[PDB]
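Q: For a teaching handout, I want to show students what a protein-ligand complex looks like in token form. Below are the inputs, and the small molecule is chloride ion. Please produce the holo structure.
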Amino acid sequence: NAMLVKLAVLFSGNGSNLENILEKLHKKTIGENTYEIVLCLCNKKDAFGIQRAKKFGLNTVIKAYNTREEFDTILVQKIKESGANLTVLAGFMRILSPVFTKNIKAINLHPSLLPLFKGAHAIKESYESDMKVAGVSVHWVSEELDGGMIIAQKAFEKRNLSFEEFEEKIHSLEHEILPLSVIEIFS
Amino acid sequence: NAMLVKLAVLFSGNGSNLENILEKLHKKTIGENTYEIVLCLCNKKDAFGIQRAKKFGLNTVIIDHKAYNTREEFDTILVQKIKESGANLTVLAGFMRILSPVFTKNIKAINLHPSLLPLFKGAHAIKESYESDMKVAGVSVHWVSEELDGGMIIAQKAFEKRNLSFEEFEEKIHSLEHEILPLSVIEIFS
Ligand SMILES: [Cl-]
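A: Here is the structure, written as tokens, with chloride ion included.
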């Protein structure tokens, strides 16, 4: 009744959420499950997260296509032959066709209480909102943008926090919920 | 400075939030303010909330919505009774009547809604918020604009859904309701 969970993490730039998932999951044993990241993927060679991945003995598989369907076909290919049981989108800034979403079990992190504040400007719009609560969400990746089945979400009270303090709470709640997210899926 | 905040409370049924308002605010003095519910109004004569009001010595004005042909004539009578009560703020606590501009343009009012607005507007919030794939839910208090359930939000609280049944989910909802509504009224007057 034991499990070795192989994970793939996709990124396009910084490598923050990528590095946070490694420290808490890569080859770490948590409960009855053991986890390892078998794939780190990037679409831009100049991204810094590649050298961040090299800090865990993890080489990174590297707008180079005029065809999205042809591009996503390679993503699916790499994830599958890695043996990854789950793909985790971490700062991956690209639009994924059904070529990916129909054939890859993937999860994504969103800095808002879905389905509220979908899209990029979630943190900004949620702070300026007259709502008094905010949070972060983890959901499955579907054909519907940020509309996949919600896995987990945590809510907090905005109060008199400045935008800096508010944003720092979101980025902290993310680093909590996202590594935790993978765990619940297999427990 | 010590104003006498007059409150009008509108309800339709059990009156749990009404009773909770009375228990925390009626003839009670918090901070600089001394609150007094000067009107309890219901549109149903058989509502149990009337009995809860009697404990505090308050009679409930009954305005049967079936006794009037239009929502407007029904509303003009609500207005006059709130006006002739001298209330400073009208609190909608389980008041299940749509309100025409006759009310909304003339009465300064707030409303309690058992969901995290602007999500789950309407009278099926608790059931929809439970069946939803969302892992959090809660309640909201908002000003009463012309837009149904769309007024400016003044208070919100959330709880994690986790593993509550709908019976337990509903309890937690009404639990937060009883806490957040009287606090909202206090927050407005400080
Ligand atoms: Cl996103």
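A: Two things your students might notice: Chain B touches chain A at residues 116-119, 133-136, 138, 152-158, 160 (CB under 8 Å). Helices of chain B lie at 16-24, 49-54, 71-83, 101-104, 125-131, 166-188.
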